[PDB]
Amino acid sequence: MMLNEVTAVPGTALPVAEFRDHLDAALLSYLRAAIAAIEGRTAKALISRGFRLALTAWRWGDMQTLPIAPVATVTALRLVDAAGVETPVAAGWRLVPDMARPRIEALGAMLPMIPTGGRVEIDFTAGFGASWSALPVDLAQAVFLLAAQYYELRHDGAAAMPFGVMALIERWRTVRVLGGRP
Amino acid sequence: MMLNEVTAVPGTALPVAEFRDHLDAALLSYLRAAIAAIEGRTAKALISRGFRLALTAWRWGDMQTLPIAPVATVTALRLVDAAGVETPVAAGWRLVPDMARPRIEALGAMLPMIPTGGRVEIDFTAGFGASWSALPVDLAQAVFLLAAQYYELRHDGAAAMPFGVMALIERWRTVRVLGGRP
Amino acid sequence: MMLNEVTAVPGTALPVAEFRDHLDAALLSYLRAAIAAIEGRTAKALISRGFRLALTAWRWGDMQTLPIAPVATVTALRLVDAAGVETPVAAGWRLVPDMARPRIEALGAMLPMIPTGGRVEIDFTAGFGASWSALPVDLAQAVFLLAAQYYELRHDGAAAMPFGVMALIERWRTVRVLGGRP
Amino acid sequence: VALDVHNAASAWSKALLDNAARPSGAIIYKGADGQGVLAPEQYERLIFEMETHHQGARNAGRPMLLEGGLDWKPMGFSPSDMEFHETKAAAAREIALAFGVPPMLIGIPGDATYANYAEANRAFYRLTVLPLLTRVSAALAWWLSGYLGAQIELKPDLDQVPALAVERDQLWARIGAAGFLSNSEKRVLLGLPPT
Amino acid sequence: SVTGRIVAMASGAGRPVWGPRDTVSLMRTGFAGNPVGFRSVKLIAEATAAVPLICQVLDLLRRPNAGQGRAELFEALIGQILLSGNGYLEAVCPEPGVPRELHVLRSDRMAVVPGADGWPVGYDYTVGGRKHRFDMTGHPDPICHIKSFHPTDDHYGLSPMQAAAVALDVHNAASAWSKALLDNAARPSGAIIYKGADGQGVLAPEQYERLIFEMETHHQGARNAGRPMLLEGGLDWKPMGFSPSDMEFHETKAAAAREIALAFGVPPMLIGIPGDATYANYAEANRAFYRLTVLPLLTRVSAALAWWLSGYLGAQIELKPDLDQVPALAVERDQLWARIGAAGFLSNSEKRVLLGLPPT
Amino acid sequence: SVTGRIVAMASGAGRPVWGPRDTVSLMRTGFAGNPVGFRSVKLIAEATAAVPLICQVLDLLRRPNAGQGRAELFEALIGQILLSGNGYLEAVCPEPGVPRELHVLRSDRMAVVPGADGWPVGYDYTVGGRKHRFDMTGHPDPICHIKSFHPTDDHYGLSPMQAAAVALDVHNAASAWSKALLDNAARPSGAIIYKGADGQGVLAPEQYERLIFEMETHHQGARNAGRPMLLEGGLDWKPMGFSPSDMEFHETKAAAAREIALAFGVPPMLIGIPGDATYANYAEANRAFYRLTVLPLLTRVSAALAWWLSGYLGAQIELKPDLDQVPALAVERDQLWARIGAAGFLSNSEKRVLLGLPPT
């Protein structure tokens, strides 16, 4: 399980013209330092970037929930071998769109099996929308409340409002209570 | 269970002329960052926007309460198959209007069954009213007490009045005490 | 188990032009004093430098997880003898890319055995990317929030913001709960 | 319901022995800051001095010198025995109550009701075996008599059952010691042919 | 018979209906895994092999084959009925009657095949990937199939082990709870906390070699139990405890070990399970053992031997357990002999017939 | 027999199927490692060697070879069946009948070889790297192989030790828990804390020599138990305790030591395990011992001696345990003699035959 992303965000899709109004190479260096700080706390994606979840063993036989939460259109399920013949499979599973648990529910059967050495990888385009105007606005507001902090103070210095950064991203974090075996 | 909304609010229905009096591209960017912050704490809708609850399995057989609370006029219950033949059904259930539990109570029978792969989806127009003058005024006041905070302070800085933002939205939040099995 | 690095970072790959904008021999002396402070807390590498893990006994027979977490392309597994005849082996194991546990899973067999005196060593190029623009931006932001502190205050003096240095590197640290026998 | 309690209270402890984390302790490493992880050069050292010198039966009591920042907080396991123990026995005794077996015969652990198996076995063959057998053999007697012509009776024989010997010997001692009536009159009281 | 034609097809005619499964995964964890499931089978199977049998073919039973003898055969036969609910017996017969050898075919490598009507057409002994395929389309029927009662299955029996398969998993794990806890657990007798002048500070190797030598020599062992241990500024001795010391799953391991004995039918006195006494003094614990779970089990195995072996010789034979030659029923036997012995009203020739003695 | 050809190949024909393994790792930790596994085997093997045997060849059994005698042979034979589940007997015979010597070949250095059909073709005694390779392609069959019952294996037996191999690992470790804890544990009687004028401060060697001499002489020992110990400014006496003092794994070591006795079949009264009483007064604990786990074990070993030694002389011989000459069955014997002794209705010549006496 790696989940490295395919393509980074272009920077033309980030609202550097809107962030300037709220407060270009230094402004855009602070939104994506605040987009990546909010996604890492909320396990979200916010810009619909492409990913590659390359994992070695399926956790269940009708599961392996995806960590990046808002998903749509799993592109492929490439089932590689050790030498890398790279034969993709095209049937057997279903992307089940769910903000709670984005999972691969399969089709009433065990998920595609993995060769000895050949790690199965999933490429999917997960996120809210391709632009900035497609986000939930409070999660878009939480980026501006954090990126304006990184702009207005440079080192780790000192200064809680009712709906702050933490109170706006408390409802996008993954609420999990299983530290168990399954 | 996704519940992505069909159409966003136009912005012509937001009271940017009234918010200015209480204190246009920067004012309207702060109400919907405070409308979406209050709806996410109260699970409300406030502007009667359209939704699509696309879920994979019915929780009960005379239930599946809807999360967005003030509902009216469930438009359709589209019961799709895996290939997407998209055949809507038109009978068997009742929208039961309730601010506590907006639920589909069915008609003395099990709810419409879901095909293997074909996720059932519900499109409904939930909210108080189509304009801003149809809201409860305290929930309209709580938006202005929050959006004037986002206007008057830009990063997560420091500063509780008797009826504040939290005391006005404490009576619209969903009071739930079931973390159980059903 | 030593893990000394093969080649240090050149300094041409460090963003001394970007660090200056955020705030050259004194600036670059403060990023790598803040890169090495964050890698030592997060057990990461951040610049894809080359390493040599020279250890004396394999902890398991299908394991020996690597400590530096983001790995790619284990170059060789040199299996030396006591006099140093230096015969590398080329088969039997698999690099399993995992941010959680970068491990050598073997190939359904015990890992290559070590001679009496001849310590087995692993050379691998672990890290995110060869440049600075390939990092996760919050881990790149945490370097700038720390290196601007080392710039702006010289001795151990006095001064916590919501996403500070510690809140940004809390999600890259190795979360371990085994102080046991295996 | 008593089966569903005895199945689940026994599968309570089956699961609890298969998915439960007790530690013997925890070596808390806060560090110089409020939090701080310890390096892989220090985590390999901390395991080797915990595996070799501090774990096992042969290391039960090593002093475990703790530096600045390190700390050993020993965890307990406070409910150790008896997870649904007297409810599993109370359910297992309500199962035996329904079928009619006394709890002595199957071995359910409980306050003794019968004394010494001479009356636990005698109550078993009198309350829930011989009433059950005299209804099955009586339906065999009527149904099989619809096949041959003559009506037939077919009932349990108490004489050839070793559990009723404590019933039988106090009968034979009752009219055996009754010497006032004659010998041919006490053979007929026991079911013996007079000679 | 009529339901023969309708239940056979509904199961798959002419194909092997394999065993219930998990029987091996219970034999190696419930008969070779814990002593309570081990001893309970070995107590019953060595009891049924000890009770003599009377004929109302004995040279076949007293010497079956070149290996296992009369007592080794029934230890092997009942040890399959108690483990898997099914007892099998191969007979080889060069002669047209009274077969030469009896072999207990083990039941986990044996499956039925139902066939056309009712009773099965053969049995498949599958070891590795090779099957034998016995035949039952004849009179002598070379495999005897002794079954325990199974209310839902038509072709196999229910092992008392399958009933107590959770109580075996509790007694295996609660005993492997304490095996592990004695092998991976850190208790210290204490901890010498060295904070230092700062909030934290390690102590030098010149000081760590001194601190061990004064802890090894002067403060550890039985011969140093109570040394004062002067503590300077900064040093501290916080003695650790071990608060649950005894009894990690102790009354649940005994409660599980008593539910294993409840399923097989052994009383807890005979194997030695520690519990509230039920029977008194082994004269009635052994008498209840040979009456509730040995002699009912032996009178079903010998009755299937009596019918199956009578298909080889011409005359129908009966073969049932002999209670007279079993020392556990002496407390039954002496209160019988004292009942009609003290009954002096009937004659001497009339009380010999009440005991099973020939009148003279 | 027919399954002979199909189970033999599925196991590997003509190659040695070695022992189960771990038998040695149980002999040196469960027979020489703890007393409960030690005494339980030595109690049974010295009981089976004490019961006399009757012939229904005795000079062979009373003097097998130049070393071990009649009682030393059966202590060595049953001590292999209880430890490894397999008893082996070599016989050397210069004469064509009734062999001269019997040798208990130890079972952990012995493996079977299955061969072509059914019963094994030989046995391999492998010490070091040298094998002997016995042969069974003949009638007298020089190795007797007494087996305990094994439900899943075809060629070996199950040691009661393999069943209780976790209960041995708990009784070894809980006893080595307290062995270690008495050898590496620091309890102090107290600690004289010297913080000093600062937050920390050591005390000088001129003051540390004074503090020892007033602690050694005036405050330690039995003769100084209660001295006031005046404490100045800065000094402090914090007395340490030792909170779990007794009973470190005490009722789990006894519960494990009772599950070892449960597997071998010894009652806990005979070896002295401390537990709730099951039997009453040793007249029934010894009688249950010679009836549940000694005489069933001896009637299987002597029955395999009776068949194997009858392959050397011409006539088939029977050789079974004699219950009459065993002092543990006197409580069985006296209630027999009082049963038909008090039965005065039958004659004198009819009650001599009920006891096994010759009528005169």
CA–CA separation, A81 vs F187, rounded Å? 61
For residue D77 the two structure tokens come to: 């396991």
CA–CA separation, C173 vs C69, rounded Å? 10
Residue reference for tokens 């530290």? A179
- Give percent helix, percent strand, percent coil of chain A, each to the nearest 5: 25, 15, 60
DSSP track, F105-126: --GGGEEEE--SSSS-SEEEE-
H-type alpha helices, chain E: 4-9, 24-30, 35-48, 58-62, 70-84, 160-163, 165-181, 205-216, 251-264, 268-271, 285-292, 295-309, 330-341, 348-352
**Among D26, D51, D66, D64, CA closest to E189:** D64
**Do C73 and D69 meet the contact criterion of CB atoms below 8 Å apart?**
no
Residue reference for tokens 């305990």? F148
CA–CA separation, F14 vs E58, rounded Å? 36
State whether residue D59 sits within 8 Å of chain F by CB: yes
Q: Which of A37, A117, A146 sits opposite C94 (nearest CB)?
A: A117
State whether residue A73 sits within 8 Å of chain B by CB: no
What is each CA distance from B2 to A20, B122, C60, C148, E137, in whole angstroms?
33, 11, 44, 42, 64
What is each CA distance from F156 to E257, F77, F102, F148, in whole angstroms?
27, 15, 21, 8
From chain D, the residues in CB contact with F180 under 8 A are: 57-61
**Do D51 and C181 meet the contact criterion of CB atoms below 8 Å apart?**
yes
End-to-end CA distance of chain D: give it in Å, rounded.
58
Q: Which of B3, B37, B155 sits opposite A148 (nearest CB)?
A: B155
Contact B25 A23 (CB under 8 A): no
C88 SS3 class? strand
CA–CA separation, E289 vs E311, rounded Å? 32
DSSP assigned state of A103: E
For residue F270 the two structure tokens come to: 């005979």
Crossing angle of helices C25-42 and C137-152, rounded to 10°: 130
Residue reference for tokens 């004394």? D115
E102 SS3 class? strand
CA-based nearest residue in chain C for residue A1 = C98
**Do B165 and B148 meet the contact criterion of CB atoms below 8 Å apart?**
no
State whether residue F299 sits within 8 Å of chain E by CB: yes
Strand order in the sheet with B4-5: B4-5, B50-55, B120-125, B74-79, B87-89
Q: Please, which contacts does D77-80 make with residues 24 or more away whose CB atoms are closer than 8 Å?
A: D77/D22, D77/E244, D77/E248, D78/E244, D80/E244, D80/E247, D80/E248, D80/E249, D80/E250
Q: Which of C1, C43, C179 sits opposite D27 (nearest CB)?
A: C179
Using a threshold of 3 CB pairs under 8 A, tell whether chains E and F touch: yes
Residue reference for tokens 């998903």? A71
- Beta bridge partners of residue A103, listed in sequence order: A96
**Among F50, F104, F51, F38, CA closest to F77:** F104
What is each CA distance from E158 to C65, C168, E17, E88, E292, in whole angstroms?
48, 61, 16, 15, 17
Crossing angle of helices F295-309 and F285-292, rounded to 10°: 30
Q: Which of F184, F194, F267 sits opposite E272 (nearest CB)?
A: F267
For residue E43 the two structure tokens come to: 């107590």
DSSP H/E element including C125: strand C120-125
Give the torsion through C-alpha atoms of E19, E23, E24, E30, to 10 deg. -170
**Among A91, E275, D128, E211, CA closest to F278:** E275
| Residues B63-96 as b or e (16 or more Cβ within 10 Å = b) | ebbbebbbbeebeebbbbeeeeeeeeeeeebebe
Cα dihedral sign, D178-D184-D185-D191: positive
**Among A178, E170, E180, CA closest to D84:** E170
**Do D63 and E224 meet the contact criterion of CB atoms below 8 Å apart?**
no
Contact D57 F185 (CB under 8 A): no
A123 SS3 class? strand
Amino acid at F289: F
CA–CA separation, A31 vs A35, rounded Å? 6
For residue E115 the two structure tokens come to: 């066939």
From chain A, the residues in CB contact with B56 under 8 A are: 96, 98, 105
Contact D37 C180 (CB under 8 A): no
State whether residue F137 sits within 8 Å of chain E by CB: no
CA-based nearest residue in chain C for residue A34 = C138
- Beta bridge partners of residue F69, listed in sequence order: none
Contact A162 B156 (CB under 8 A): no
CA–CA separation, B61 vs B63, rounded Å? 6
From chain D, the residues in CB contact with E190 under 8 A are: 63-64
**Among C66, C43, C82, CA closest to C174:** C43
DSSP assigned state of C95: E
Residue reference for tokens 């009757």? F54
Q: Which of C151, C159, C167 sits opposite A157 (nearest CB)?
A: C159
What is each CA distance from F100 to C43, D62, F304, in whole angstroms?
76, 60, 18
At residue F146, φ and ψ (nearest 5 deg) are -85, 125
3-state secondary structure labels for all residues of F272-339 = CCCCCCCCCCCCCHHHHHHHHCCHHHHHHHHHHHHHHHCCCCCCCCCEEECHHHCHHHHHHHHHHHHH
CA-based nearest residue in chain F for residue E79 = F151
Residue reference for tokens 């294993």? E260
Contact C43 D44 (CB under 8 A): no
State whether residue E36 sits within 8 Å of chain F by CB: yes
- Beta bridge partners of residue B5, listed in sequence order: B51
Amino acid at E114: P
**Do A157 and C159 meet the contact criterion of CB atoms below 8 Å apart?**
yes
**Among E116, C100, E266, E160, CA closest to F292:** E266
DSSP track, B47-108: S--EEEEEESS-SSSS----SSSS---EEEEEE--SS---EEE-SS--EE--SS--EE--SS
**Among E34, E6, E46, E52, CA closest to E258:** E34
Q: Shortest Cα distance from C24 to chain D (angstroms)?
A: 30
What is each CA distance from E20 to D174, E23, E82, E110, E162, in whole angstroms?
55, 7, 14, 11, 10
CA–CA separation, E342 vs E335, rounded Å? 10
Contact E221 F263 (CB under 8 A): no
Resolution (A): 3.4
**Among B125, B121, B99, B123, CA closest to B112:** B121
For residue F344 the two structure tokens come to: 């005065």
**Among C1, C33, C38, C34, CA closest to C173:** C38
State whether residue D177 sits within 8 Å of chain E by CB: no
CA A155-A160-A164 angle, 5° bins: 90
CA–CA separation, C102 vs C95, rounded Å? 8
For residue C75 the two structure tokens come to: 């170059």
E-state strands within E200-242: 235-238
Q: Based on C-alpha coordinates, what's the Rg of chain A? A: 19
From chain E, the residues in CB contact with D117 under 8 A are: 279-280, 284, 287-288
End-to-end CA distance of chain A: give it in Å, rounded.
17
From chain A, the residues in CB contact with C18 under 8 A are: 29
Residue reference for tokens 């001129």? F206
- Beta bridge partners of residue F89, listed in sequence order: F144
Q: Which chains share 3+ C-beta pairs under 8 angstroms with A?
A: B, C
CA–CA separation, D170 vs D167, rounded Å? 6
Crossing angle of helices E285-292 and E35-48, rounded to 10°: 70
User: Mutation test of the interface with chain A: which of B3, B81, B155, choosing the one with the most A Cβ atoms within 10 A?
Assistant: B155
Question: β-strands A50-55, A120-125: how paired?
Answer: antiparallel
F46 SS3 class? helix
Count of beta carbons in the 10 Å neighbourhood of residue D158: 14
Technique behind the model: cryo-EM
What is each CA distance from F199 to E198, E232, E233, E312, F238, in whole angstroms?
11, 11, 7, 100, 17
DSSP track, D11-61: HHHHHHTTS----S-EEEE--SSSS----HHHHHHHHHHHHTTTSSSTTTB
Amino acid at D132: L
| Residues F3-42 as b or e (16 or more Cβ within 10 Å = b) | bbebbbbbbeeeebbebbeebeebbebbbebbebbebbbb
What is each CA distance from C54 to C87, C91, C120, C121, in whole angstroms?
15, 18, 6, 4
Give the torsion through C-alpha atoms of E18, E24, E30, E31, to 10 deg. 110
CA–CA separation, A170 vs F36, rounded Å? 61
Residue reference for tokens 């405070």? B34
Contact B56 A105 (CB under 8 A): yes
Q: Shortest Cα distance from F250 to chain E (angstroms)?
A: 6
Q: Shortest Cα distance from D86 to chain F (angstroms)?
A: 20
- Beta bridge partners of residue E192, listed in sequence order: E237
Q: Please, which contacts does E203-211 make with residues 24 or more away whose CB atoms are closer than 8 Å?
A: E203/D67, E208/D65, E211/D65
F194 SS3 class? strand
Count of beta carbons in the 10 Å neighbourhood of residue E318: 12
CA–CA separation, E48 vs E61, rounded Å? 14
State whether residue C96 sits within 8 Å of chain D by CB: no
At residue B50, φ and ψ (nearest 5 deg) are -90, 145
CA–CA separation, E57 vs E312, rounded Å? 10
**Do B65 and B102 meet the contact criterion of CB atoms below 8 Å apart?**
yes
CA-based nearest residue in chain C for residue A41 = C171
Contact E187 D74 (CB under 8 A): yes
CA-based nearest residue in chain C for residue A82 = C94
From chain D, the residues in CB contact with E179 under 8 A are: none
For residue C182 the two structure tokens come to: 């295996």
Contact D57 E183 (CB under 8 A): yes
E153 SS3 class? coil
From chain C, the residues in CB contact with D50 under 8 A are: 179-181
Counting Cβ atoms within 10 Å, is residue A173 exposed (0-12), middle (13-18) or buried (19+)? Answer: middle
CA–CA separation, E137 vs E14, rounded Å? 13
For residue C5 the two structure tokens come to: 């690095």
DSSP H/E element including A149: helix A137-152
**Do E157 and E149 meet the contact criterion of CB atoms below 8 Å apart?**
yes
CA–CA separation, A177 vs C124, rounded Å? 36
For D:99-118, CB contacts with E below 8 A are: 104-110, 112, 116-118
- Beta bridge partners of residue E147, listed in sequence order: E86
For residue B98 the two structure tokens come to: 């309730």
For residue D7 the two structure tokens come to: 């199945």
